[PDB]
Amino acid sequence: SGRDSLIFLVDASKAMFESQSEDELTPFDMSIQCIQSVYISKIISSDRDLLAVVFYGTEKDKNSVNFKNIYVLQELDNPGAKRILELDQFKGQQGQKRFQDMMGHGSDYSLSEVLWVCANLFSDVQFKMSHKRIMLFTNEDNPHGNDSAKASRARTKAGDLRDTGIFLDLMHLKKPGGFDISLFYRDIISIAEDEVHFEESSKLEDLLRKVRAKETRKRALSRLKLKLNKDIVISVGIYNLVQKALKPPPIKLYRETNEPVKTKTRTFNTSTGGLLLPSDTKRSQIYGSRQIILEKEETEELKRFDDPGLMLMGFKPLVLLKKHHYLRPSLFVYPEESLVIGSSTLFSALLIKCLEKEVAALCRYTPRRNIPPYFVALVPQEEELDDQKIQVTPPGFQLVFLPFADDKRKMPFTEKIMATPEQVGKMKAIVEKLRFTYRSDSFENPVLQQHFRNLEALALDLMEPEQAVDLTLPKVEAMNKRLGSLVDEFKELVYPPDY
Amino acid sequence: NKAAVVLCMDVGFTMSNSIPGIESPFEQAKKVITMFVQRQVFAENKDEIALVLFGTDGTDNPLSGGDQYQNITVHRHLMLPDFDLLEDIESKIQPGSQQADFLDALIVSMDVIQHETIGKKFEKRHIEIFTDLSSRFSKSQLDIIIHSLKKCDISLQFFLPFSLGKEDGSPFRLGGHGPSFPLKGITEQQKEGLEIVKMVMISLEGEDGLDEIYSFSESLRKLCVFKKIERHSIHWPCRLTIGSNLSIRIAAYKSILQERVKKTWTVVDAKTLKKEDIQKETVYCLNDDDETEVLKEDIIQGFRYGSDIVPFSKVDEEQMKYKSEGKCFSVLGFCKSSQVQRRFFMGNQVLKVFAARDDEAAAVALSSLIHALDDLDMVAIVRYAYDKRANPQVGVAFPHIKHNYECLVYVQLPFMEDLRQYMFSSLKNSKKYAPTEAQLNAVDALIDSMSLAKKKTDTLEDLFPTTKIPNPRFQRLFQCLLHRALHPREPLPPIQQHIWNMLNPPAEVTTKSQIPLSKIKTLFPLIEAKK
DNA sequence: CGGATCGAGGGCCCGATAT
DNA sequence: GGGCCCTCGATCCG
C-alpha cells in the first residue's frame, strides 16, 4: 500500500486567458474548475492521495528554490475544504480578474525549471509515493519554439523525470488552428508499453473525463487463478469498475478534545467475568428440541468447495444469457502478467475468438477460501474510445454473476391482456417525443451530494448548508410542455373509465 | 402456504437391480427423497409429509379389501417431518423383495390425503411417485384414480431412473448433465408403464403435464421437487409515473434475489452450550497517542471532510440530511436499448413490474407501454424508492413479453459517484501480446469443442442451464447438519459426488475439450513469476 | 490496508383483540 | 408477524 502523489501544473500565459473564440470558458477557467472537481471527488472517495497545484508563467514567483515565474499555490498535501475555497477564488470571469490581480500572467517561463520544481516537490514527501504523476494543463502546442536552449533542456528534464518514475500526462487545451503533439509534448510525455493519445479538450466535461481516467491507478480487487484445465492455468485480476459509493462511517470523538476514540469490543463470560478464549466457544443451531453443535472449524469446513479462482466450464452463446438474470454487480476481468507469464497472450486470443463467435466463457467463481462457488459468465467486452479517444469501454471480460435456482423467485400469475394497436401507436408517439440520451454519469447521488454539501458548509463554520437538488426527479413541467394534447387524447383512449 | 405431500416410493426388488456404474434406482430414489425431506425439515415449513413404500416384504395399509394393495406400507403418516424420519430413510428403510402395483400405491397415498386433511388443513395436495415401472400393473381403476385425483385436487409428480425426453429425442454420472440414464435400460414393460404415466399426467394437467415426469438424476439438480409446494412470492404496489395524467399504478415483486442462509450460528460455551453465558461489552479507549478510556456519555458524533474532522451530532444530521420526496416509480425518460449496457447494472435485486391485479385500465395502460418500447426497441430510465426513508435509485425499465405473461423489468443503474474510470492497456494492437494465427486457430478449435449449446428442430438447447441448478450451499449444509445430528462422534462427511457431478459440465464437453486443450497447452506458454 | 456479509436496529400491514 | 431497508460490526485480502 501507499499514498499517491498528484501534481496539477497549469499554464498562465496570455493564450490561457483567451477564450479561443468559442462559448466555453477560457482554458484557465476550464483548468481551475477541473482541479476543484478532482479535489472534491478525492474528498468523497476513501483515498489518502496527496494533491498539489503549481502555476508557471506568472510574474510573482513563490517556490522552494526561488525560480523565477513559478508559483506553487499548494504543496503536496491532503485535499481540504480550505484548499477548494482557495481554488474557488480563481473560478470564473470574476475569478480570472482575481488571478490577474493576485499574480501576473504571460511572463517568460522555462519548462526545465518548472519540472525541476515539481520533482523537488515530490522529494519533500515522507510517506511512500506509490505513483508520482504530473498533469500539465496548457494550450501552447509548441512552447519555447523561439528558444532552442529552453526546449532542449525541458526535453532532458522530462527524460530525467520518466527515469525517476514520475508520470507526465498532457492536458492539451483548445488552440487556434488545433493542438499539435508533434511540435511539443510528443517526446516529453510518459507513454505506455501498449501504445495513441486523446484529442484536444474543448469542453470541461471532456477535460474532467480525461483527467479522471488517468486520475487513479488501476487497483485490483483481487488476483485470482483462471484454470482452463488442471494443467493450463493463467492469472487474472478482478477489478470492480462500478462500486456503490456510500456515506462515510462516523467517527466517535470526545466532547472537549474532539479527538477520535478507539472502540474495543470485548466478549467475556457471565459466570466468571474474565475474557474467554475462542477455544472454549462453540456454535449451535436449535431445531425444535434438538440442538446441533459445530465447531468454528466445522462451520467453515462446510463452506469449503473450490479453491480461490475461476474454473472454466465452457462457452455459452450470448443469446442464452438473459438480461433479467442480474444478481450482483458485474466485475471486470483483465490479465495479470505479473503473476503468470504468458497469461496476456492466451487472454487476448480468447477475447478475440470469443467476440468473433459471439460466445461467453462460463466459469465457476470462488473468490476466497472456504466459500461456496457461483457460476459466472465472462462476456467479451471490446475496446471503445470516444471522439476525444478516451477509453469508454476497456478490452477484456465482464464477469456477469448468474443466479442459482434458489435466487429465481416464483412469480404471481396474472392474465395476459394485450392492448389494441391504436393504443400502442399512441404510446409510441409519447415515447418518441420523450426520447433522450442516457449517460452513465447523468445523475449524482442526492444523499451523498447533500451529505458532502452539508459537511462543506459546516466545514467553513459559517457556510449555511448547501442544498443539493435531486437530479433523479423528472422534469415534470418540461415533459408536460413537450406533450400537452397527446396526454389528454391518450388518457381518453386508454383510460376511458373515471376512477 | 401449507400443503399435504405424500411420497410414494417403490422399494421392490427391481428397485434393487442395479446397472453397472449407476447407483440402484432404490438408492437414487432414496437420495432424491432425502434431498426433499432435508429442505422441508431444516427450513421448518408447515407442509406435512407422509411416506408410503410399495413392494415391501410386509403389508401395512388402510385399503386391504380382498387382499388388495398388498406389500404396501405406510411407514409415516401425514405429519410434520422430524429427525427420526430422516434417520429412518438414511438407514432403517431397506429394499424389499416383492413388487407392487404403483397405481395401487397411488390409491393408498390418496386415502392418506383424503383422511388426514380433514378441515381444509392444506392449501395444496401433492403426491410424488418414485418408481422404475419395471413391475406389472393393472389398468382397472385408472378412470377412478384420475377422478379421485381431480375431485380431491391432488397434483402428481413422477420420478423414474431414466428420463423420457432424451428417449424420444434419440459413462454415467448421477446429477450430471446429459448422459444420466442408459438408453438401453428401458424394458417393454417399462415402456408400457410409461405410456400410462404419460396419459395420466396429461389427463390431470393437460399437455404440459408431461413436464412433471423427471429422472432421479435431473431431479437432484433442480428444485422441481418443491415446485408444487413452493410459497407464492410477496408482491407490493406502487405507481409508475410516466408523467402527469400518464401515471400507471403497478405492483412489482423481486424477480431475482439472492437466497441466503436462513439459520444463523449462535455462539455458545463449549461446556454449558448456552449463548446466555457469553456476553459482549463495548469499551472505549482513545484512538490517539494515548489509549485512555473515554466516557460513553461524553462521546460525540463526527464526520471527516478530507483532512478536516468536523463534529456533526446525530441530532443535527437527521434535520440537515436529504429528505426523499417519497416512494415512486417516476419515469425520467426513454432511450434506445443500445444506450443501456449490462455492465452498468447495479443493486442486489431485479424487479418485475406487473400490472395491478383486478385492474383492467392499468393492465391495458401498462401493456401499451410495454409494446411501445418493444416495437421501438427502446427502454425507460426511471427513478425508484420503495419508501420515503429509502435512498433514491436510478435504473432501467425494459419490456419483457412472452406468450403467457407481459411485464416490465427494472434493474438499478449507477450514479456518477458509483462509476469508476481506469485506463487499461489495449490488446487489439499490443505488439508484445498479439497471438499467432496458429494460436488463434487453436483457441478457435477449443471454443468450438467446448460449446455448451446444441442448436431437425434447429432450436438452441442449452446443455448447461446454470439458472436451473440449485445453490450447492444449501444441500451441503443440510448434509453436514444431519450427519452431525445423527453421528455426533464421526467427523463431517465429504461433499457428496452428485453435487460435484451436477456442478461440472456434461461429460461430452469435457471429453471433447481434451484434444484442443492439449494443443493449446503447448501453443500457449505458461510460466511462474519468481525473479 | 476496502468489499462483502450478517446481526440488530428501525418503520407499515394484518388476524386476534379487550373494548 | 412478515417484508423491507439501512447502518455498523466483524471477516478477511490488497
Query: Helix, strand, or coil here: A300?
Result: helix
d(CA A439, CA A206): 13
d(CA A202, CA A22): 9
Same domain (yes/no): A228, A345: yes
Cβ(A382)–Cβ(A367) under 8 Å? no
CA-to-CA separations, A71 to A132, A383, B101, in angstroms, rounded: 20, 40, 98
| Runs of H (alpha helix) within B117-161 | 142-152
| Runs of H (alpha helix) within B74-127 | 83-87, 102-116
For residue A270, what is its C-alpha cell? 457471565
| Runs of H (alpha helix) within A387-475 | 421-433, 446-459
d(CA B182, CA B116): 39
Cβ(A99)–Cβ(A28) under 8 Å? yes
Same domain (yes/no): A322, A394: yes
By the 10 Å C-beta count (0-12 exposed, 13-18 middle, 19+ buried), B123 is classed as middle
| Cα-Cα-Cα-Cα dihedral sign, residues A62, A63, A69, A74 | negative
For chain B, the helix, strand and coil percentages under 3-state DSSP, each to the nearest 5: 35, 25, 40
CB neighbour list of residue A160: distance below 8 Å, 6 or more residues apart: A119
> In what helix (H) or strand (E) does residue A355 lie, and over which residues does it extend?
helix A343-357
Same domain (yes/no): A196, A71: yes
Write out the DSSP string of A102-136.
HS--S----HHHHHHHHHHHHHT--S-EEEEEEEE
Q: Which nucleotide is nearest to A252 (CA to C1')?
A: D8
B127: phi then psi, degrees, rounded to nearest 5: -120, 135
By the 10 Å C-beta count (0-12 exposed, 13-18 middle, 19+ buried), A28 is classed as buried
Same domain (yes/no): A58, A199: yes
Same domain (yes/no): A268, A370: no
Q: What residues pair up with B330 in beta bridges, in sequence order?
A: B241, B383
CA-to-CA separations, A364 to A226, A231, B425, B445, B465, in angstroms, rounded: 10, 17, 26, 22, 13
d(CA B387, CA A35): 37
Closest residue in chain B to residue A284, using alpha carbons only: B266
First to last CA, chain B: 63
Residue B416 CB in 7 A reach of strand C: no
What amino acid occupies position A427? M
Nearest to B349 by CA among A456, A392, A236, A409: A409
CB-CB neighbors (< 8 A) of A281 in chain B:
267-270, 278
Instruction: Please identify, among A266, A283, A306, the residue that sits at the C-terminal boundary of a domain.
Output: A306
**Which of A300, A302, A451, A467 is the best residue to mutate to test the B interface, defined by the most B CB atoms within 10 Å of its own CB?**
A302
d(CA B237, CA B386): 10
Nearest to B411 by CA among B441, B379, B389, B443: B379
- Dump strand ranges (E) for A70-221: 70-77, 129-138, 166-172
For residue A69, what is its C-alpha cell? 515565474
Q: Do B284 and A280 touch (CB under 8 A)?
A: no
Nucleotides of C under 7 A from a protein CB: 1-7, 11-12
DSSP state of B52: E
Q: What residues pair up with A377 in beta bridges, in sequence order?
A: A362, A400
Note the maximum CA span of chain B. 92
CB-CB neighbors (< 8 A) of A78 in chain B:
306-307
d(CA B198, CA A267): 62
What amino acid occupies position A51? L
CB-CB neighbors (< 8 A) of A428 in chain B:
372, 375-376
Residue labelled with grid coordinates 451530494: A449
d(CA A442, CA A209): 13
d(CA B422, CA A239): 10
- Dump strand ranges (E) for A336-388: 340-341, 359-366, 374-381, 384-385
CB neighbour list of residue A78: distance below 8 Å, 6 or more residues apart: A48, A50, A51, B306, B307
DSSP state of B107: H
This PDB structure is determined at a resolution in Å of: 3.0
Q: CB contact, 8 Å: B259 with chain A?
A: yes
What amino acid occupies position B452? L
For residue A316, what is its C-alpha cell? 455459452
d(CA B81, CA A331): 42
By the 10 Å C-beta count (0-12 exposed, 13-18 middle, 19+ buried), B255 is classed as buried
Domain at A171, CATH number: 3.40.50.410
| Runs of H (alpha helix) within A143-202 | 148-164
Nearest to B20 by CA among B192, B169, B172: B172
d(CA A95, CA B282): 51
Same domain (yes/no): A175, A35: yes
d(CA B492, CA A302): 8
Same domain (yes/no): A167, A234: no
Q: CB contact, 8 Å: B306 with chain A?
A: yes
- Solved how? X-ray
Q: What residues pair up with A9 in beta bridges, in sequence order?
A: A54, A136
What's the per-residue H, E or C state across B252-318? EEEEEECCCCCCCCEEEECCCCCCCCEEEEEEEEECCCCCCECCCCCEEEEEEECCEEEECCHHHHH
By the 10 Å C-beta count (0-12 exposed, 13-18 middle, 19+ buried), B335 is classed as buried
Cβ(B379)–Cβ(B394) under 8 Å? no
What amino acid occupies position A68? K
- What's chain B's length in residues? 531
Same domain (yes/no): A204, A220: no
CA-to-CA separations, B240 to A198, A423, A474, A484, B252, in angstroms, rounded: 42, 18, 12, 19, 10
Same domain (yes/no): A137, A236: no
Chains A and B form CB pairs within 8 A to the count of 588
The string over B264-285, giving b where at least 16 C-beta atoms fall within 10 Å of a residue's C-beta and e elsewhere, is: eeebbbeeeeeeebbeeeeebe
Query: Helix, strand, or coil here: A205?
Result: helix
DSSP state of A257: T
d(CA A485, CA B243): 13
Domain at A282, CATH number: 4.10.970.10
Number of separate helices (H) and strands (E) present in chain A: 12, 19
Instruction: Please identify, among A282, A306, A330, the residue that sits at the C-terminal boundary of a domain.
Output: A306
d(CA A72, CA A123): 15
Gaps in chain B (C to N over 2.5 angstroms) fall after 170, 455
Query: Helix, strand, or coil here: B47?
Result: coil
| Protein residue closest via CA to C1' of D9 | A265
d(CA B157, CA B229): 12
User: What does the radius of gyration of chain A's CA atoms come to, in whole angstroms?
Assistant: 29
Q: CB contact, 8 Å: B390 with chain A?
A: no
> In what helix (H) or strand (E) does residue A52 lie, and over which residues does it extend?
strand A50-56
d(CA A326, CA B254): 11
d(CA B270, CA B273): 6
Quick one: how far is CA A344 from the chain centroid?
A: 24
d(CA B29, CA B74): 17
Same domain (yes/no): A173, A264: no
Cβ(B480)–Cβ(A302) under 8 Å? yes
d(CA B230, CA B244): 40
A-facing residues of B in 473-512 (CB < 8 A) are 473-474, 476-477, 480-481, 484-485, 488, 492, 495, 503-505, 509
Instruction: Please identify, among A196, A215, A234, the residue that sits at the C-terminal boundary of a domain.
Output: A215
Query: Helix, strand, or coil here: A38?
Result: helix
Same domain (yes/no): A387, A428: no
DSSP state of A41: H
The separation, in Å, between residue A209 CA and nucleotide D7 C1' comes to 32
**Which of A42, A45, A407 is the best residue to mutate to test the B interface, defined by the most B CB atoms within 10 Å of its own CB?**
A407
What's the per-residue H, E or C state across B472-495? HHHHHHHHHHHHHHHCCCCCCCCC
Number of folded domains that form chain A: 4
Cβ(A126)–Cβ(A72) under 8 Å? no
CB-CB neighbors (< 8 A) of B474 in chain A:
406
Q: Which fold has domain B3-226?
A: Rossmann fold (3.40.50)
* Domain that residue A201 falls in: 2-215
d(CA A499, CA B242): 18
Q: What residues pair up with B268 in beta bridges, in sequence order?
A: A282
Cβ(B161)–Cβ(B126) under 8 Å? no
d(CA B155, CA B228): 8
Same domain (yes/no): A236, A249: no
d(CA B392, CA B327): 8
Quick one: how far is CA B345 from the chain centroid?
A: 23
| Protein residue closest via CA to C1' of D5 | B390
Q: What residues pair up with B411 in beta bridges, in sequence order?
A: B396
Nearest to A177 by CA among A367, A27, A20, A338: A20
CA-to-CA separations, A9 to A6, A115, B330, in angstroms, rounded: 10, 9, 44
Write out the DSSP string of A301-312.
HTT--S-SEEEE
CA-to-CA separations, A45 to A246, B344, B418, B419, in angstroms, rounded: 9, 19, 10, 12
